[PDB]
Design a protein around this ligand. Sequence first.
Ligand SMILES: OC[C@H]1O[C@H](O)[C@H](O)[C@@H](O)[C@@H]1O
Ligand SMILES: OC[C@H]1O[C@H](O)[C@H](O)[C@@H](O)[C@@H]1O
Ligand code: NA
Ligand code: NA
Lengths: 270, 270
Amino acid sequence: TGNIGVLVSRVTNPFFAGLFDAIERELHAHGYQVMITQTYDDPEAEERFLKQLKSRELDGVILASVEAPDRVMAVAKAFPGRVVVVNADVQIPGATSLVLPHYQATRDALDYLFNQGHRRFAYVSGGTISGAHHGQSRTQAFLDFMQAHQLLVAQDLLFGQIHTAKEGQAVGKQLASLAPNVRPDAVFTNSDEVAVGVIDSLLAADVKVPDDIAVMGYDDQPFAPFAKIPLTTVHQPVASMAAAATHELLKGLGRQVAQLHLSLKIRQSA
Amino acid sequence: TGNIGVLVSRVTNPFFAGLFDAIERELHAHGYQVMITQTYDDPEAEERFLKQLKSRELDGVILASVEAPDRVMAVAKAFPGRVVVVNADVQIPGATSLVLPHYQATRDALDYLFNQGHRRFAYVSGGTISGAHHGQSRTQAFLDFMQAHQLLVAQDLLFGQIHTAKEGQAVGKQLASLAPNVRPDAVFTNSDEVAVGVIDSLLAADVKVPDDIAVMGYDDQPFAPFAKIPLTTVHQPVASMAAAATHELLKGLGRQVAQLHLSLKIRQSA
Ligand SMILES: OC[C@H]1O[C@H](O)[C@H](O)[C@@H](O)[C@@H]1O
Ligand SMILES: OC[C@H]1O[C@H](O)[C@H](O)[C@@H](O)[C@@H]1O
Ligand code: NA
Ligand code: NA
C-alpha cells in the first residue's frame, strides 16, 4: 500500500478540503500515503499531475476536478483500475466515474425559491457562463428553470468566474447598490463561500436577507450552519462520496473485494 | 524545477489550507509541482513523508507542523537546503526555520482581555495541556499571564485536544450550562474554528457574546470577519510567512539569490 494522489481545483475551497480529508483518512487506514495537488483549473497542472501516475510515482489517483477529459481517458485506459473520477460531472471511459445529479438538485433548489415567491433571479457561477465550464449541468438547470416559468433572464444579474467569499462580497455590494425594482429577489450562488460574501455585503448595506434578497448556497460546507445568516444550501454528501471513490480505487488496485444523494438544506438565508 | 511537499497536521484547518495555497501559488509560478500531506499529529505520518525526500521523490519540503524534531533534524542535515520549517514553534538544526512570536501574541491578547475587565478565564488548546504539545508557547503565555495577575487557574475551565468547530460546540454547550457565578468571563480558544463553534453554542443558550462571555479566536481565518459574531482574534500573517518559507526553500535549492508579525484583530466577539 503506496502513494495515492488526489486532484482538486482549489484546496481553500472547504468542499475540496473536506472531500480530501474523508478520502485521506480512509486510505490512510488502509496503509496508503495520500497527497493533494490543486490545479486552479489549469489543464497543464492536470497533465503534470497525471505524469506522476504515468511514471509510477503514484499507484492511483482520484480526480475531483477534470479539465481535459480526453487526456484523463488516455491515462485511465493505459492504467486500468488506477484512475477514479468523483463528482466532476463527467464519465471518463477507462476510469470508474461517480456523477452526482447536480442538474436535479439545482432545479429543485430553484423550484424551492420560486415557491417562496421569488421571481427576479441572479445566478452566479464559477465558470464562464457563455462557454463550456465547470458547473454547466447547474447552468443548464438554471436556464431550463427560467424557461419553464417563462422568466426573462436578466443578463445584468448573471455573474461568472466567481469563486471566493471576497468575490462574493463584490457581487453582493453591486446587488445591494441596485434600486429595489431592478434588485433580484433571490441569488443562486453555486457556492457557500460565495454566499457568505454576498450576504455580508447585503447586510452591510441594510439589505434584509432573506426578506429583501434570498441567498441560496451550494455544498453545505462546515461553516454553512454557523454563518451570520445560517445558509440555506444544497448539501453534498461529502463522506459518502469519499467512501465510494475510495472503494472504487481500492477495488481497482486489487485491495478490496467487490460489494449518493444531494439534498436541500433549509436554514435562514433562503 | 520539480516536486515539493508541504506537511501540515490537517488540511481542513483553514489556516493550513491558506498557508498551503500561498506557498503553492508562488512555487507553481517558479515551475514546481507542490503536494500537501496531512499527519493528524502522527509521528509515523511525518516519517513516511520525509522518506519521500530521502528517496528523492521530492526536491524539497516545507513543514508547517513537526512531531519529532530530532527526526526532522537528521533529514535536514542529510539534505542541506531542502528542508524548511515554518511556524512550528521550533528551530530545527540543519533546516532554515521560521518561528513567530506566539508567546508574545498570546500574552498581548490575554492582556487585552484583562483590560476589558475579564477575570475568570477558560483556556482551550489543541494539545494535551498537561504534557508537551503543539501550542505550548501559548499555554506558557497563559499560565504566565494568570500568575502575573494572581488569578487562580480553574482546572474545570481548561479544555485540551479541542480542534474543530464541532468540538468547540461541545465546549460552548458546557460553558453555557454553567451558573453565572462559575461561568468564565472570557474564553481563549486557540483557533477560529473552535471559536465559531463555542460562540454558536453560547448564542443557542441565550448567553450573550461578548457581554456574558467574550470569545477570543486565533489565526484570522477567512471566515473570521464573516462569523455570526465577527471574531476578535490573533491574526497570523499567512501570505508573508508563506513568501518567507518559499524564498528560504528556493534559496536552499539554488533557484533564488539571497536578499513576520502577529497582530490582534479586534472585531465583535471580544
Ligand atoms: O464549492 C463550489 C463547487 O466547487 C467545485 O466546482 C466543485 O466541483 C463543486 O462540486 C462545488 O459545488
Ligand atoms: O488553527 C489553530 C492552530 O493550528 C495549528 O496548530 C497551527 O500550527 C497554529 O499556528 C494554529 O494557530
Ligand atoms: Na422578497
Ligand atoms: Na462580562
